[model samples]
Each structure stands twice: as C-alpha cells, then as structure tokens.
Target chain A: RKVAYLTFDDGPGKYTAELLNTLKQHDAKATFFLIGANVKEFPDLVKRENAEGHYVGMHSMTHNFAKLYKNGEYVNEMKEDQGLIANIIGKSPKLTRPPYGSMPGLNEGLRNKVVEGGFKVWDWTIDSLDWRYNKMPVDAAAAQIAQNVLTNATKPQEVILMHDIHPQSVAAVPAILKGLKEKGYEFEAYHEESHFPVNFWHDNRM
Target chain B: KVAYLTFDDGPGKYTAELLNTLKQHDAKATFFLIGANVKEFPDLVKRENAEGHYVGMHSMTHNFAKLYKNGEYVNEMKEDQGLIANIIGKSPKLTRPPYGSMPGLNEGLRNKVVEGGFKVWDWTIDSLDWRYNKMPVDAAAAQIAQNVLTNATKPQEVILMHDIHPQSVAAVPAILKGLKEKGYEFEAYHEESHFPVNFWHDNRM
Candidate 1:
C-alpha cells in the first residue's frame, strides 16, 4: 500500500486533542513524537494515542538546545525520556525523533550510541513549517502541506512533519488530510520495524 | 557622569542610522534590541554593546499572547526573561511591558511576577515616537528638542524612544543638543528615578 506517515510534534497541547479528533473523524492515523514535558502534562492523550492504534514516539526531556547540545547530554536525556514515555504508555517506544532535526555533534560515535539502544530515529520527508510564529493561514498551510506531499514525497511512502502547538495548524489539518486522502494514499501506524527503508541514525550511508 | 540615552526596537534601516549619527556627535548611547533584519545587517547588538554602550534586555521573542495571557504573565515572562538573561549577562529588572500593561491581568498574574521578583516598568516621558511629530528629520528633531526642553522637570529623565525606525535615530543628535543646551547633566540610571508604578499608560491614538 502507498502509505503516508502523518507525524506531529510539541503536543498534547491545547490543540492536540482537536487535531486528534479531526484525524479520527477522517479515519486517519498518525505518529505523535511528543516531548517529555508535553507528554507529562497530557499523559492521557498519549495513552489515547497508543490505545487508538497510533504510534507513540519519544522526543526529548527538554527541547532546549543549549542543554542538549552545549552540555552534550543527548543520550542521557533521551534515555530518561524513553523511560518516562514507557512508564506512561506501558510499553517502551523504540522510535525517536530528534528535536529541531538537529543532532548537535551529529557524528558516527553519537549515532552509534543512539542506535545501540535499539531506538529507531525518524526524520521528515516533508516539513509543514507549522512551528513558526509566522505560520501560514489555514488554506495556505493546507496548500503548503499538499504541495510538499505532491512534489517532494514521491507519491508512495511519506513521513510528513507538522506541529500541534498552534491554532492555525490545527485549523488546517482537516483539509490537508482530506486532500491527501483524495490522492489515493493509505495511512499506517509508525513502527521502528516498518519495512519502508529505515533511516537508522548510524546508517546514513545513503 | 555620563547618561546613556538608549533606544529599543531599531536599526529600522533609516532610523538606526539617524540614532547612530546622534550618538556619534554626543558621545554614545545604549540600545535595547529587536529587528532581526537590523541585527543581521550590522552587528547591531554586539556593536552597540561593544562600543561601551548598554545592551539591555527587551525580550528576544516579543509576542504578547505567547508571553502574556489571561493570568499567566510569569510563565511567559520567565521564558522571555531566561532568553534575555541567557543571551546577555543579566535579565533587565527594568522592562517595558508590551502594549503598556496587561489590561486583563488579574491579581494572580501580577503576584506570579511579584513572587518571582520582577519589577515591571513603563516610560515616564514619551517622545510620541509612535506618532509622527513631523515628516522630515529636522522637523522631528525640533519637535523633540521643544518637548524635552519645555516638559522635563526632573534632573534625570528616562527618555522614551522607538529605535525600530532609523529616522528616530537621525533626530537624536538634534534633540540631545537641544536638551544639553538647557544645562541638563546626563547620568546612566538612578535608583531614585526608577520609581515603581501600580499601573499607568498613555493611550495611543
């Protein structure tokens, strides 16, 4: 099946529930890569996500770059984050998404450490730019999302990045999903073992 | 005793140069920050702070709703406060609250800041920078000079200015000349002049 992996970040926020409702209404499933802080606030939503058959992924304990990058605490912090999410969701998540898509000191040694922990690292094929303060209007965000899926995503396996932190994006989710659905795409729950050419942190030999 | 007449929100392309010219003539002044574009063009932040001028905190991420809402001022303030303190050396005890003051702020919001020990501030003398005093720099300068000379009662004044525009900077030299001519001695900032307020605002038309 030509599948789309819809992913969201920075949520279980004011708009997360709304976005989830919209997705359910459209019969679409997504992967939620949640930060530790946000997950702590809305553990119920994370539980709902897992129970509803969506992938529950861990981001990090803190999204702060200076602490994660400058302090060189990526592995330690991410491990604790994994434990925290597992405790809440009752099963350890093997999937991880790096904050800002930046692995500061992104190198073989660090990638090996992350990969050795049996964690699958996922990056986006399409960026919605929904995290910006200058977020596009609903139609504009929808259009931009559709454009990325149509142009960049190669019409088969797509992992799209979005944010549920803003109202504008929440408002745009329905239309974007509808447009993608009309494009004859199927939806899939995210798993580290998914057979669509895994991009392991240490295996960027492509 | 040198007083640094600093302005915030500038390098407005035109106004920043004007303010820079004014500072050049009368020694130097401090600049609080904004304008990602200006900061990109010139080492505006580094240059202003490096040139023996003050570079104080004015919130790196200045968004009213994100920083201030119904009754969560401290939550947002702490975020902005940490941002500034991290960027510069210290968080400014002196803050120019966006949009004057939070009109809908409750006691809880106010107390959150009080507990965290934030002393909110507002300007005493506005140059009416938001409104056009005149069209030209020379005309604007004259208006400022006239306003300062006639209205300034205290020995020290926290002259309010908008650095977002370059024209305001251009008018600075003339305004400073007009003020200096009136025998006003400049001092950095005094504890006595740093009066706290319950709340006061000048309504903008």
Candidate 2:
C-alpha cells in the first residue's frame, strides 16, 4: 500500500557485496547510482546488481562539483557514464544523479541542457547521514543510521539516500528495510514512465 | 519505433470517419468489431478489410455479466468468429477482450481465452478517450490526445483507444501527429508474427 525507494550512490565497489547480501535476505529491491570509473573496474558487480533485479542509474564520470557546474561538461560526463553502463548492460538508463545534486547549480539555460540530454534526475527525502558517521564504529553508526531512516521515512514515495561503497551504510541496510516493513512501506525501484520530477526546482516536466 | 493502434467497440456512424482520418495520416490500425454491428453494417466490415486495417473480433454480446462467466467467454468469441468468417474471406485470429486482460480478479477466464485460438493484445498505452464523456467536446478531445502522448516513451507500444465515442475518434488525428513527433510509426496487428502483449507474461498471447 505504502512505498519507499532506497537509492545508493558512488557504488559497485568496496562493499557492494555486503549491501546486496543484506538486501537479498529480505527479498527487497533498491536502485544504484554507479560511477563510470567503478563500473569499468568492477563489471561483474554491475551485472550482479542488474541480474538480481535492482535498477542501475548513472552518476558522473568524475563526480567533480566545480568541473561539472562551471566547466560546462555536466551533461557530457553523464552521457559518458551512461555509455559505460550501456556497454555493460545493453540498456541505457535515463535516470541519473548529478555530482552535487541539481539545486542552486542549474538555472533555466542549464536545466534546459539536462532536458536536451534526455535525463531524469532523482533527489531524496530521507537522508541516512551514513556519510557523516563513516568515522564511527560500524555497529554504532549502523544503529544510528537505521534509526534515522525509520523516523524520517514517514510519508509514502519517500526516496532514502545512502552510499553503497561505505561499510557502515551497507551494514545499516538490513535494519532500515526491516524497520520500514514494520512501518508498512513496500520497497520499489523507480521507473521513468511512472515518474514525477523530484528536483529542488520542483519542475514537473523534467 | 513500431506502434499497434487498436480501437474497440463499433462499426457505427463514426467508423467511416475514423477510416478517413487514418488515411490522411497514412496509418493502419486494428478494429475489434462487435458481431451485431457487423451484421447491421456488413459493408463497413468489408471496407475495413478492403482498405488495410485488420478487421478483428471483440465479442458477440458485450454484456459484462455474461462474458465473464467461465463457459460463456470462449463461446462468445467463437460465435463472433463464425459471423466474421462469412463477411470477410476467413475467420479473424486477433482479438481483444471488452475491458482488457486482467488475469485473476477480472480476467478469471484468461486461460480459456488462449485456448480459443486467438492472439490476444492488451495495450501498452490507453488514450483514456472514454474518460472525458461529460466534458465539452473540444476539451475532451484535447485531453484524450494528451493522455496518449504523455505515455509514448517506449520504443514499441500497443496503444488502446476507442472509436465508439465522437470525441475519442476525433482525438485520433492529434494522437497520430503527437506519436509521429515522438518517433513512432504506426502498424496494424498481424496474426503471423505474433508477439504476446497479454498480461499473463507467458508465451501464448
């Protein structure tokens, strides 16, 4: 009845296996925003994520904030990353997450560039704060991360943000999923067809 | 970039008008006709086949209560099939149900539909041409066109619309223009190279 879309970024590296294992234990599905550099290094991991029925979206090739926002290669980097993923999976995904998100960076002309590139972007409502707690002990950080998710993920159609490459974030996934289930949220991956633009600008057409 | 446009319901006053509109766009479509309407206007059925559209079957009696019963479902298809066989050269092999192919809750008769020797198609996009009956004709027609265009993102799609309503039929010209601009070419459903568009997600239809 209710739904949650859990998305992980900067992934298909270091701790991807642990994240997949914990998710599979509950038969839950999520989405991955992969870096082009990591997709080339760990091609098999890309296949595993797709084969197991998780949505794979693109993150930029460099993940650089200023190089993308100022140097005018933002769309170029996303297209390059999409090319790498298409080479691996044979299907190109249109949904991508910009390096620093599409908030104060894009104006009318720049937003038009995103539309011309034919990309659909996603921003999240439930921020896990796993990036902030990566320095703490794994169990301590995970418990706080999972607890933060359950409280914030109150509404339907909430997208939960986490990074798959972090050990603490991967470890937090199981409890987050379990807690969401208890709160009556079914996990689902995003679709381009059934999308409403989730950007900071509140543009519906994107 | 292929689209199979299908219209279910009639061979009424709007039928010939729709044919003319399709001709203007160089488009071919499938018409799932009612058996009673075929009997009333037998020449219309021939004109549909004469021009290039697929003259397919809907049901003899479109009564929802009788058609959903287990034994009566396939019987209606056969009864209509026998009627269409005489008007055209042979019986039609393509059919779409009244509401659509909904598996268990609505399509409890889905298993028997395949056994009746028809290739089923439940469309990928619905124009919702039927939804705006209460509105002004101009407004209703525009909305029906927009409903179809918003969902035309896929490479190949089987689009569902109706010919019974004037507004629905009127929306076709705009629907064609919008779909073409979105990079889709229209084609009629073929019995030979059948791809299953049914909701069963199985091979038969």
Candidate 3:
C-alpha cells in the first residue's frame, strides 16, 4: 500500500484542537509544523501535540517574509523556535518547512546551510491550497484538497501540505482520511528513520 | 584520507603568518574571507589567491542580525562577491556563513545562494582556536592539535580555524604536522573533486 504523510502548517491555532481531535478519532498520524509564537500562546495544544503521537516540527517564529528572507534572518527565528520547542517538548525538532515554501527564491546555498544547521527542509509534494479559501467556499476547499491528493499521489510516499489555521481545512480532514484509507493509502507520521525526500528545486511540483 | 583546512574571518594581522606557515608545510587550504577585511587588506587576499589557496566568501559586516535577519544572504553575499572579484579578478564559488550555519536559512535562501553561484561550506571539526585565542600560544596549538586528532574520524574531514588571531595562526603548523602524522593528506577546495558538505545527508561526500 502507498503511504501518505499529512502535514499541517501555521498551527496550534484556533482550529488546531479540532483538527487534533479529528486525527485522534480517525487514528491517523500527522505532522504539525507550528509557528513558534503560536506554540507559546497555546502551550497546552503543543503539549497535546507531543503527548499524542503527532510529529511536531518548526514552521518558523513569525513567518514574516520580509524578516525571514532578509540576510537569512529566518535562521535566527528558526533557532529561537527550536529552543522554544525543545523547552516544551524536551527535544529539538529536526524537520522544518520554510514559510512560503522553497521555490521562486530559495536558492541552493540557503538549502545547504539549513541542512548544515541540522534541519531537513521539507517542501510539499501535494498542496491542499486551503489557504486560498478567500477565493472559494469551504466545501470547494475541502474537495480541492481531497481531489489533489487522489489525483497527484502517484508515488508510494507523499507529503501533503495543509494549514491548521483554516476551519475549512480542519473540516476537510475527515473526508481526506476516509478517501485515502479507502484508496489503500496508509497514513503515516514523519519520522527520522522514514524521512521523505525534500524538494529544493525551483519547480518543486511532483 | 584527506583533510580540508578552512580558515574563517580573515585577511587580518595573522594572515601573512598563517600563509607563511602553510607555504612552509607545502600545504594548501581554503580561506573564507570577510568583506570588511578584504577591503581593508586587498593585498592579503591577492596574495592568498596568488599562493594557490582557495578564497571563499564569509560575510561583509559579519553581523548576524543584519545578514540573517531577513534572509538577505544573497545581497550580503553579492556585495562580498563584488569585493572579492574586484580583487581576485573572478568571483569565488564557495562560502561559509558567519557564526557557522544557523537554523534560519530556509530552502528559498539556499536556492538563492546556489543560484548566485556560491557553494555554502560548513565545518565538521572545529579547532576551537577562536575560543583559545586568549590562552598561551602553546595551549591554543595543543587544543587545536587535540581537536584535529580527536574528531577527524571520517575519510574526509573539513576542519575549521580562523586566520584573524595570531594564536590560531601559530597553531596551524602543529595542526598540519599532526594531521600529516596521522596519514592524512591536505586537500584544497576544488569544484570538481571536493564533495559538498551537508548536515543531514553524507551522500554528497
């Protein structure tokens, strides 16, 4: 059976609790790449994230592009976030998902440095695009996420990106889990031993 | 086995001494040049290249806040690249970030640096010469010798030192001798032969 790794970004937000409950009910394991500031605000949720079997990774502190992209300041934010996560979870996270993905501007030198700094920089093979809900309704958003997974998941392993901040995305999870399970897709959490390959090229689709 | 010696934050007072020591040993190394120092001592950079040592970019100001604050690595690197090219007559392809590799470098910035034609270099064995600079020269040399001998377990090890301090420069000859005694060959940075050093994966080497 093919394996699907469900990853949510920008979390411990309003819908995170709901999302976590959904995953728990379905017995699905997912990875949450949280914002450091949110982790501070929602310490309990972070604890729940770790206390449960979900893999917790960093999505940076602020997610501010101007601050992050400037002279590689995002590295400092990542350090601060790592420290915060380590303090909360008792271990530093080894995986990171760059805010705004790793294309259009993320060059090779920066990728090597992140890898050198002891992070496996992860970019998504499947994007739910739930963040674009301003242009679409909740049902459309959910369907799009499920449809994208069903259509594009050609490989045995895939990392699917979603946002925990969106209510529609949280609502989309049950169907996503159901559909993939029916398709013989086993939901797996990202672990160091079974790490997915990270995409660093300009054209990161596939 | 081969050892790659990398000197960071340089073109300083001890650079000439370090150069002479490497020459005396008939060894080649790579220097990660600071932009401010490169401007202050263009002659040292010229001599480093002339002596057949690899010259790579470090940073212009060496300020972590300014360089890494907003992923402006490319801008800082481009500015530094201009300075080195002006002096060496060609842009360098290798770089080592100041304060070592920080977690803030995202994939986009990584792509930017590689697209800008620079290979980011990080060290496997840190000689700790920067920390022992205030100690006696022999103490610092001993520490470096101990560090190089202890940590270099791989077939190819990139050892980091600094050329800005006299104590670090003083430690170079002993470091070379010790590594040579350990049956290690000194390797210079070559685009074709030297494998790119990465943190998570060792497959590149």
Lowest summed lDDT across 10 adjacent residues in model 1 chain A is found at A133-142
The digit string of per-residue lDDT tens for model 2 on B49-103 reads: 8888888888887655467643476788788888888888888887787766543
Per-residue CA lDDT of candidate 1, range B1-205, in tens? 2233657665456544644565566455545454353345354554554455554434434566645564444565555555445545555554445554534333334445556766655445677655653467666656665665566666655566777644465557666776676666543333234545324221110
Candidate 2 to truth, TM: 0.51
Candidate 1 residue A128 Cα shift, in angstroms, is: 0.9
Candidate 1 — which residues are off by over 4 angstroms? A102-105, A133-151, A195-206, B1-205
Residues A1-206 of candidate 3 have per-residue lDDT tens digits of 68889999998886799898998888899998989999899989988988889899988988988777656766677788989998998989888888998774356666667666877778888888877653343456677777766776677787889988875678678888998888778887889776656665733221
Q: A1-206 in candidate 2: lDDT tens per residue?
A: 58899999998898998788887888888899999999999999998898888899998898887777777677888899999998989889999887656754555566788898898877776678788896879998999999989887644468888999888888889889889999999887887767766765545446
Q: Let me know the DockQ for model 2.
A: 0.01
The per-model lDDT (C-alpha) reads 0.62, 0.81, 0.79
Best by lDDT: 2
**Once superposed on the true structure, which residue ranges of model 2 sit more than 4 Å away at CA?**
A1-206, B104-108
Q: Every prediction's TM-score for the first chain?
A: 0.86, 0.96, 0.91
Provide DockQ values for all models, in the order shown.
0.02, 0.01, 0.01
Best by DockQ: 1
Fnat per model, in the order shown: 0.00, 0.00, 0.00
Residue A60's lDDT in candidate 3: 90
